[PDB]
């Protein structure tokens, strides 16, 4: 039938999805700002349709109840056919994957660590090996997945000293996270994606560093139903503006053009 | 019907896939090693199938002729029927994208500049502005193309430069650019694929450089005639080689475990 406004799925977090400080003033897709409504204008006008952002309801990315065996987040809005497209800086995994079709990489990215400058580790490795200083990840996410179904020795270790560690080690949202990190004198570390850490350290007041490289390697993805229609020509544009140059003009843009640490 | 030994299309390319030094005394698969034959074993044991390694007739990776509109290489034989699945580095393209299925990058990358040591040139920026240091890549491949289709001042004038060059700056293989840089005491720069890139600078005679960040952001993928019923299992499967650590592994197996430069 007829063409219908593209329902878009998204979540405010910092700086994909931000309310503009006079959003009361505007409305629609201009109440918002950011690398990912940026990215959503660039996929809607190469692949022509008209779209409306909305948040997700839940406030969640991406995760299947172990009991219920339900999605929530964006991906359960693409699931349950609530949205027709989720753009966010959704990791691309093997189990959403397996429900979702995600297009190729738009920001490639790992898991790093945050430490307050002056913090005496270096690597991963340093932070297994000790527990003076404190380290933890987000409650729910990718990366708490990651060091919970790891096998690798390191990580195993890490996530064993995570789940006995007291007082928890776990932050519910990437603000506590880096609020954390800032106000625990050096006793905290904090394991988030590198693209998170590296805007964090381009922000005043400029106190926190990542150290070492990343544990992984893996990307953020648009992700659409299983075999919608949008999926291809969404895929085959986010590829035309990594090309163009376009991805990394939007990632300086909102990650160093206005870099507040010189 | 019956299920049927998967043939495999990759290409002669060191470290991906080469042929064992004894391979003379071995057969079949047996008789190759590399990077992309380890991976072409794990995705197969995923998957769950059996497989044959055949070497592309024409020696080509993946283009489309302009007059013809045929395609060569590796894709051209997906295209075609010739093979089910390609896996050799392969790099995502959106031409490639859309005439054959892509999985998920296996490998991270970018284009980079490679110098013999001693170079006074530490980005693409540097090269730009002269012609003392001459400067060229393959004559055909994903980075030639980067260059031939930019729209980015620096890189519009470097392309420019090197189709009016004389000699000319172009090879037609990487140890031709490689050999090139070694033998022409700083005259030549090399841009290619920063996986190439790391892995000559980790081989006699180590006389060689990467300089500068990575021009663009992008992958390798396993390529499967679209549509294939393969496609999906192995998108899942390389998904979960990286997440397994598998991927870092085998990178490390080919690059750095046996480093000849310290
Ligand atoms: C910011 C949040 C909660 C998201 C962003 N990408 C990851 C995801 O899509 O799961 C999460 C971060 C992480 O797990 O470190
Ligand atoms: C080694 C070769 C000729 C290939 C490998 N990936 C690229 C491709 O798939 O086009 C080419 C390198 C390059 O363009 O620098």
Redesign the pocket.
């Known amino acids: 039938g007829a063409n219908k406004t593209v329902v878009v799925t998204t979540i405010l ?1 910092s700086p994909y999805v931000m309310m503009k400080k006079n959003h009361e003033m505007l409305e629609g897709n201009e109440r918002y700002e950011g690398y990912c409504v940026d990215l959503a204008a660039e996929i809607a006008k190469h692949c022509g349709f008209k779209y409306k952002l909305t948040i997700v309801g839940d406030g969640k ?2 995760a299947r109840d172990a009991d219920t065996k339900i999605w929530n987040g964006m991906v359960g809005e693409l699931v349950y056919g609530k949205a027709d497209i989720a753009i966010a ?3 691309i995994t093997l189990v959403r994957e397996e429900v979702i079709d995600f297009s190729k990489p738009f920001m490639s990215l790992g898991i790093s660590i945050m430490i307050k400058k002056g913090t005496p580790i270096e690597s991963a490795e340093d932070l297994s090996k000790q527990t003076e200083i404190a380290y933890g ?2 409650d729910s ?4 997945e990651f060091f919970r179904r790891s096998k690798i020795a390191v990580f195993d270790k890490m996530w064993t000293y995570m789940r006995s560690a007291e007082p928890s080690v776990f932050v519910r949202t ?1 603000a506590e996270g880096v609020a954390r990190v800032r106000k625990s004198k050096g006793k905290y570390a904090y394991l ?2 590198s693209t998170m850490n590296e805007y964090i350290e381009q922000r005043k007041p400029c106190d926190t560093m990542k150290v070492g490289g990343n544990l992984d390697s893996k990307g953020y993805g648009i992700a659409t139903p299983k075999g919608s229609s949008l999926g291809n020509a969404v895929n085959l544009a986010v590829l035309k503006l990594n090309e163009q140059g376009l991805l990394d003009k939007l990632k300086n843009k909102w990650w160093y053009d206005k870099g507040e640490c010189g």
């Open positions: 977090e990315w991406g800086p959704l990791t990840t987000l996410g990718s990366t708490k990437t988030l994606e």
